[PDB]
Amino acid sequence: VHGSLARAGKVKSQTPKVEKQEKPKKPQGRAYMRLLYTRRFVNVTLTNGKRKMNPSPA
Amino acid sequence: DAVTIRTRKVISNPLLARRQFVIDVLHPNRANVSKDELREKLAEIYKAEKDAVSVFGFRTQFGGGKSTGFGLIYQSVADAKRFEPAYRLVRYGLAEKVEKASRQQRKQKKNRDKKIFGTQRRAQKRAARRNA
Amino acid sequence: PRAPRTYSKTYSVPKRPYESARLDAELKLAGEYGLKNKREIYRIGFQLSKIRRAARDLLTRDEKDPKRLFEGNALIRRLVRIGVLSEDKMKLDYVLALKPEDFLERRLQTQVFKLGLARSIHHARVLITQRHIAVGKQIVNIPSFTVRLDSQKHIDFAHNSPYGGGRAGRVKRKNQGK
Amino acid sequence: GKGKPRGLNSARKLRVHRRNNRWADQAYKARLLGTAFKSSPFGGSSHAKGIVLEKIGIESKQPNSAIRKCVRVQLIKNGKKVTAFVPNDGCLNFVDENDEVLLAGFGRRGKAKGDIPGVRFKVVKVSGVSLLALWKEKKEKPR
RNA sequence: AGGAUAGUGGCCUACCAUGGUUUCAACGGGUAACGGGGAAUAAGGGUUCGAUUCCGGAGAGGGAGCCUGAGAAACGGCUACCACAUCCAAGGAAGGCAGCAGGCGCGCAAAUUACCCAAUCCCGACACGGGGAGGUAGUGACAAUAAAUAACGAUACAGGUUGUAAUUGGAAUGAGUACAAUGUAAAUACCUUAACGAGGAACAAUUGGAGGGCAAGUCUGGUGCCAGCAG
Numbered sequence: 001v002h003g004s005l006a007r008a009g010k011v012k013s014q015t016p017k018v019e020k021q022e023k024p025k026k027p028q029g030r031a032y033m034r035l036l037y038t039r040r041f042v043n044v045t046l047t048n049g050k051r052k053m054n055p056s057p058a
Numbered sequence: 059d060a061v062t063i064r065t066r067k068v069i070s071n072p073l074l075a076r077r078q079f080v081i082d083v084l085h086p087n088r089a090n091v092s093k094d095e096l097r098e099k100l101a102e103i104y105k106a107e108k109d110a111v112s113v114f115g116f117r118t119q120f121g122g123g124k125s126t127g128f129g130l131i132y133q134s135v136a137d138a139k140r141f142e143p144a145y146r147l148v149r150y151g152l153a154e155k156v157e158k159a160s161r162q163q164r165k166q167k168k169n170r171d172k173k174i175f176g177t178q179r180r181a182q183k184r185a186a187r188r189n190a
Numbered sequence: 191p192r193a194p195r196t197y198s199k200t201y202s203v204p205k206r207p208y209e210s211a212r213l214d215a216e217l218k219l220a221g222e223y224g225l226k227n228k229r230e231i232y233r234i235g236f237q238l239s240k241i242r243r244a245a246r247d248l249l250t251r252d253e254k255d256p257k258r259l260f261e262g263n264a265l266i267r268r269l270v271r272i273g274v275l276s277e278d279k280m281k282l283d284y285v286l287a288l289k290p291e292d293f294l295e296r297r298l299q300t301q302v303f304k305l306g307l308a309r310s311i312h313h314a315r316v317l318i319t320q321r322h323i324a325v326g327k328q329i330v331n332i333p334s335f336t337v338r339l340d341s342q343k344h345i346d347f348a349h350n351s352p353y354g355g356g357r358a359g360r361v362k363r364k365n366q367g368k
Numbered sequence: 369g370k371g372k373p374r375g376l377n378s379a380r381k382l383r384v385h386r387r388n389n390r391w392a393d394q395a396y397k398a399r400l401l402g403t404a405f406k407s408s409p410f411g412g413s414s415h416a417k418g419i420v421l422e423k424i425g426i427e428s429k430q431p432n433s434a435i436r437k438c439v440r441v442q443l444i445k446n447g448k449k450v451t452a453f454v455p456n457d458g459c460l461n462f463v464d465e466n467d468e469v470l471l472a473g474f475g476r477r478g479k480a481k482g483d484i485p486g487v488r489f490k491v492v493k494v495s496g497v498s499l500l501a502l503w504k505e506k507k508e509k510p511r
Numbered sequence: 512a513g514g515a516u517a518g519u520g521g522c523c524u525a526c527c528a529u530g531g532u533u534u535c536a537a538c539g540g541g542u543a544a545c546g547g548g549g550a551a552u553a554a555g556g557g558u559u560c561g562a563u564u565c566c567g568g569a570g571a572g573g574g575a576g577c578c579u580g581a582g583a584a585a586c587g588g589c590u591a592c593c594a595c596a597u598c599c600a601a602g603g604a605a606g607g608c609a610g611c612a613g614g615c616g617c618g619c620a621a622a623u624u625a626c627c628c629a630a631u632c633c634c635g636a637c638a639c640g641g642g643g644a645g646g647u648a649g650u651g652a653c654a655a656u657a658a659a660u661a662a663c664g665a666u667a668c669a670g671g672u673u674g675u676a677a678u679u680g681g682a683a684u685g686a687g688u689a690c691a692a693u694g695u696a697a698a699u700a701c702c703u704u705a706a707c708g709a710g711g712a713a714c715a716a717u718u719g720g721a722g723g724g725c726a727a728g729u730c731u732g733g734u735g736c737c738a739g740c741a742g
């Protein structure tokens with residue numbers, strides 16, 4: 001159960017390649033700050049102190 | 059169209075036989091005002107001749123419209139020729155450009171001449187009898 | 191050689207990069223006043239901190255101290271002429287109570303959407319950038335341009351803009367062909 | 369009390385005493401001995417260049433088990449031999465024997481890092497191009 | 512006491528005396544030491560940096576010796592030696608970029624063999640000439656300032672009076688290009704500006720992270736103490 005110099009790049013080389021999915025652009029500058037402000041302090045999703053910024057789709 | 063001109067901070071300069079002032083130009087719906095047109099309008103306002111008028115260093119304000127600069131009214135035309143730098147007269151068409159080679163060529167020429175003691179005639183003849 | 195020209199930095203980043211409470215506070219301020227980044231909040235924080243420091247240093251002194259009588263009143267004059275203070279708080283004690291919103295309210299962008307020249311504060315900034323706004327008869331395209339109390343009533347549109355007595359932009363001039 | 373003199377004409381004793389005991393602090397002692405100039409492999413520089421002599425794998429220390437890919441490097445400025453870690457998955461294949469690499473410190477100002485014993489440097493560039501560019505296929509290995 | 516110097520002085524000479532410095536650190540050694548005005552950090556007290564825009568000193572490959580001149584132990588002056596380096600018809604002759612630009616080398620590490628005396632100012636017999644001093648442009652993500660990359664409507668939605676939704680339109684404009692004038696010594700750029708100049712407004716923002724310190728996933732696939740991550 002040893003590694004070796006011959007095993008260099010194993011996991012990356014055998015990783016199944018997946019291309020990016022074409023998605024719309026994200027607004028830059030003041031518009032992005034506007035967007036984040038609307039997410040968090042305008043269209044609230046709070047429920048008794050559960051405010052996950054990155055919930056898992058489920 | 060409708061170009062208003064004003065002067066401020068006026069100095070009379072008998073020492074240089076002229077009059078010094080700062081020009082203020084109001085030209086709505088127009089990019090700027092040419093220096094020759096400004097000179098003619100100034101000559102008309104002050105009944106002086108155009109070839110005794112000087113305008114330089116004009117700067118349009120931010121956004122547009124108001125522009126500013128400097129103006130010089132020489133009391134004659136000989137005084138204009140006598141107290142005016144060559145480049146401004148060349149701009150005005152009053153004077154011609156002095157003809158000369160590039161600065162590097164002039165310097166190289168000068169450094170070749172330092173090689174010779176005397177006149178070019180003697181050096182040329184000596185080289186002639188030096189070769190053939 | 192020629193003498194060096196002075197230059198200074200006008201802001202400072204926070205000592206703790208990830209305090210969540212103040213992150214939310216900065217996001218609220220940017221959203222309320224339509225800012226572009228967090229550095230615009232940092233600049234007003236810088237200005238407010240130095241103003242409060244100056245007021246505190248002067249307030250260490252007696253009411254009869256000449257240095258206070260000169261510099262504190264100059265500071266009060268500058269603050270009350272820009273709109274941060276009113277005509278009833280000239281004592282350097284109300285200088286200590288100023289908050290970033292006091293300066294944010296006196297920006298060009300805030301006053302443009304307050305007067306009515308634009309609907310949203312974002313639309314106000316967007317008009318300011320495209321040179322549709324003139325203070326006096328001077329076009330200003332700087333949203334952080336701070337308007338003084340004797341400048342608030344002269345904000346309006348520019349004579350050459352399509353919103354204040356101008357011609358049509360390229361879009362309308364191409365769309366009027368038919 | 370307090371074991372230090374307090375007399376108002378005791379400035380010499382206080383100053384000399386502080387000067388003697390500052391030698392017990394590592395940073396002061398290093399900057400006054402000039403150890404970076406005299407004994408550091410980089411001679412006090414932040415980065416250094418060298419020629420790769422050999423690829424070596426180094427066993428990670430406990431409680432880890434791995435082979436950390438590194439290269440033995442001979443520096444150009446002084447001819448010193450140092451070992452540098454080549455950081456990322458498969459980036460050892462980008463470097464070869466006789467290549468010219470740029471080395472940097474390894475983050476802890478002369479100390480080893482993590483579970484890698486005896487390695488105090490990392491490869492930044494090989495053949496004049498960064499490893500981060502090569503790993504991400506943002507550039508190409510020159511030839 | 513004399514000599515020498517522009518002049519004082521062991522500065523040097525002759526004669527004479529035995530003095531001078533030192534644990535309150537002399538003397539010697541090191542400095543990856545030119546000094547200061549200053550810089551960063553900064554409760555206070557401190558710690559560290561200052562080759563470098565100004566001031567003072569020193570040098571012109573290394574030493575030494577001089578001419579001229581009011582002023583130099585001058586090096587874009589001379590003489591000699593050492594070391595480098597050039598031409599040659601082999602007898603001989605010519606050198607000093609730590610000035611500007613440029614090359615080689617060195618290295619982690621730093622730009623054009625450009626334009627000009629218009630400005631600052633200096634020099635001359637001089638109102639006129641000269642000035643890589645200086646200024647102008649080129650390169651330039653050292654550092655610093657401001658500041659785009661989108662804005663607003665209506666349908667269907669919806670919510671509990673608009674805070675929220677896709678698809679439906681019309682405007683707004685500066686990046687860019689270009690008459691023009693302006694800017695300039697002549698240019699370039701800025702600024703003003705005619706004609707152009709936006710739907711994927713593809714005119715498409717990146718750099719690092721997502722266990723804790725420390726803000727943000729136990730979502731999916733791959734690998735299986737390997738490969739790799741990790742201050």
Ligand SMILES: CN[C@@H]1[C@@H](O)[C@@H](O[C@@H]2[C@@H](O)[C@H](O[C@H]3O[C@H]([C@@H](C)O)[C@@H](O)[C@H](O)[C@H]3N)[C@@H](N)C[C@H]2N)OC[C@]1(C)O
Nearest residue numbers: 381383384385387388389390391392397400401534536
């Ligand atoms: C070889 N390491 C030396 C270590 O030996 C020690 O040196 C001391 C030195 O500081 C002492 O010296 C010290 O103390 C004397 C005091 C006694 O008067 C002071 O006068 C002197 O200025 C001061 N440097 C010296 N007398 C003995 C060395 N071993 O501390 C300094 C050091 C560099 O770390």
